[PDB]
Design a protein around this ligand. Structure first.
Ligand SMILES: [Cu+2]
Ligand SMILES: [Cu+2]
Ligand SMILES: [Cu+2]
Ligand SMILES: [Cu+2]
Ligand SMILES: [Cu+2]
Ligand SMILES: [Cu+]
Ligand SMILES: [Cu+]
Ligand SMILES: [Cu+]
Ligand SMILES: [Cu+]
Ligand SMILES: [Cu+]
Ligand SMILES: [Cu+]
Ligand SMILES: [Cu+]
Ligand SMILES: [Cu+]
Ligand SMILES: [Cu+]
Ligand SMILES: [Cu+]
Ligand SMILES: [Cu+]
Ligand SMILES: [Cu+]
Ligand SMILES: [Cu+]
Ligand SMILES: [Cu+]
Ligand SMILES: [Cu+]
Ligand SMILES: [Cu+]
Ligand SMILES: [Cu+]
Ligand SMILES: [Cu+]
Ligand SMILES: [Cu+]
Ligand SMILES: [Cu+]
Ligand SMILES: [Cu+]
Ligand SMILES: [Cu+]
Ligand SMILES: [Cu+]
Ligand SMILES: [Cu+]
Ligand SMILES: [Cu+]
Ligand SMILES: [Cu+]
Ligand SMILES: [Cu+]
Ligand SMILES: [Cu+]
Ligand SMILES: [Cu+]
Ligand SMILES: [Cu+]
Ligand SMILES: [Cu+]
Ligand SMILES: [Cu+]
Ligand SMILES: [Cu+]
Ligand SMILES: [Cu+]
Ligand SMILES: [Cu+]
Ligand SMILES: [Cu+]
Ligand SMILES: [Cu+]
Ligand SMILES: [Cu+]
Ligand SMILES: [Cu+]
Ligand SMILES: [Cu+]
Ligand SMILES: [Cu+]
Ligand SMILES: [Cu+]
Ligand SMILES: [Cu+]
Ligand SMILES: [Cu+]
Ligand SMILES: [Cu+]
Ligand SMILES: [Cu+]
Ligand SMILES: [Cu+]
Ligand SMILES: [Cu+]
Ligand SMILES: [Cu+]
Ligand SMILES: [Cu+]
Ligand SMILES: [Cu+]
Ligand SMILES: [Cu+]
Ligand SMILES: [Cu+]
Ligand SMILES: [Cu+]
Ligand SMILES: [Cu+]
Ligand SMILES: [Cu+]
Ligand SMILES: [Cu+]
Ligand SMILES: [Cu+]
Ligand SMILES: [Cu+]
Lengths: 132, 117, 118, 116
């Protein structure tokens, strides 16, 4: 669907890596879902009081990944400054979320899944950023 | 159900992205002046689906009234967006793709809504 | 006449979203966080729906009363639920008292607009 | 200083709403074909300001790198949106109002960023 809409856009996109752009959008949507699920699972743990930083960072990562996917999906009136700045924010938050979840991943499968999604999204954002 | 909940969350996030992409494609059409209702409805559908995905991710069974009310709003907006994009789908492949994403999301929301009661 | 009520509801929704996010964050920092998890979840839901609602209401191009009423109904429902949950903790936590007042005010502004359309 | 954080959150939510309204107003102009970059940038600014308001509401000082990165994105988008709307502000009152909201938000985000 993401690649579909990208191919039907009514103009040339410059020379942005189209396949990398589509991959990053897809990763951001998967990552947002993984983060929201991790936040919800942490909230239901009896040890929730020890997982508050994890929860907060999950929520931040979901919000930024959702914003990022939206900004990346838009090509009209493209502004490299905005796109680069949002990708950099997303990479930073995904790295932070990955770090926090990795600390709980031994104990909680939900944080293991979330950490993998965040690392993958971090890498897809960094790759797109380098390719612009 | 959990599996149906996760399917609906995924559909909502894809739908929001499809609507954003459709709005942007419409905005770049030379005939943009004829696509303004499509663009506005896409924007509404993106905002409601984004909210819906977030609300559903935190669903616990407790206060099903909230979940049902949000699902109903989402189904309604997806159907409206699907109807508008379907009008331009013969001419614009982006609206065809968007209409399909909205119908899929509409159906996933209706299915989940029926399964909560 | 719809427009002044629409603007009032948009303003209420933005105040409500901020109050809910602040309440969720304050609950998260309480030593008793384990007892406030439903409050936190509902605050987050109310912030998301109020932000969506304010955006839908701000748009007049290609207006469709059915969509607007459906979103307002969702918003009214979530504000009422959030108001109820925060009211349970309002005796103990000032943040939940403030949030409950914002949600009731937003609930009422959404119900008023809904009745006036439809 | 927590009051500054709350002020910035409020500004971000107002800015998102102002951008949404400007995008909608532009969409209804007969000259919409000339306003597409304004509309697109308004939509980006709404999404980023919405994200920013949420991130800031949960800020604890722990991982300041996240908050700073988000504020930097927000400042950049608000500046871009402010620039584009300022170009149409002579002709469209909606873009004048939106440009003022974006400049205020840009400045509040830059100020907060410097203070962390
Ligand atoms: Cu987890
Ligand atoms: Cu569509
Ligand atoms: Cu509200
Ligand atoms: Cu509360
Ligand atoms: Cu409310
Ligand atoms: Cu991501
Ligand atoms: Cu994530
Ligand atoms: Cu988690
Ligand atoms: Cu995350
Ligand atoms: Cu993320
Ligand atoms: Cu990210
Ligand atoms: Cu992440
Ligand atoms: Cu995570
Ligand atoms: Cu975790
Ligand atoms: Cu996690
Ligand atoms: Cu993650
Ligand atoms: Cu991520
Ligand atoms: Cu990413
Ligand atoms: Cu949807
Ligand atoms: Cu959609
Ligand atoms: Cu479209
Ligand atoms: Cu369209
Ligand atoms: Cu749509
Ligand atoms: Cu939607
Ligand atoms: Cu939905
Ligand atoms: Cu929907
Ligand atoms: Cu839709
Ligand atoms: Cu549509
Ligand atoms: Cu459409
Ligand atoms: Cu389209
Ligand atoms: Cu369309
Ligand atoms: Cu469409
Ligand atoms: Cu659609
Ligand atoms: Cu949809
Ligand atoms: Cu759906
Ligand atoms: Cu609220
Ligand atoms: Cu509460
Ligand atoms: Cu609330
Ligand atoms: Cu709310
Ligand atoms: Cu409301
Ligand atoms: Cu509400
Ligand atoms: Cu509270
Ligand atoms: Cu509370
Ligand atoms: Cu509340
Ligand atoms: Cu509320
Ligand atoms: Cu309201
Ligand atoms: Cu802002
Ligand atoms: Cu703005
Ligand atoms: Cu505008
Ligand atoms: Cu404009
Ligand atoms: Cu703007
Ligand atoms: Cu903005
Ligand atoms: Cu900002
Ligand atoms: Cu901003
Ligand atoms: Cu702006
Ligand atoms: Cu602007
Ligand atoms: Cu503008
Ligand atoms: Cu304007
Ligand atoms: Cu403008
Ligand atoms: Cu503008
Ligand atoms: Cu603007
Ligand atoms: Cu603006
Ligand atoms: Cu702004
Ligand atoms: Cu700002």
């Amino acid at each position: 669907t993401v690649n579909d809409l990208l191919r039907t856009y009514p103009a040339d996109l410059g020379g942005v890596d189209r396949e990398a752009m589509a991959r990053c959008i897809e990763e951001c949507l998967r990552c947002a879902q993984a983060c929201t699920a991790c936040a919800d699972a942490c909230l239901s743990e009896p040890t929730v009081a020890d997982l508050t930083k994890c929860i907060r960072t999950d929520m931040d990562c979901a919000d930024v990944c959702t914003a990022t996917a939206a900004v990346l999906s838009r090509h009209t009136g493209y502004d490299a400054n905005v796109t680069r700045a949002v990708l950099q924010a997303c990479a930073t938050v995904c790295a932070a979320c990955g770090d926090e979840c990795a600390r709980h991943a031994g104990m909680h499968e939900h944080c293991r899944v979330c950490a993998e999604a965040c690392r993958s999204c971090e890498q897809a954002c960094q790759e797109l950023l380098a390719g612009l």
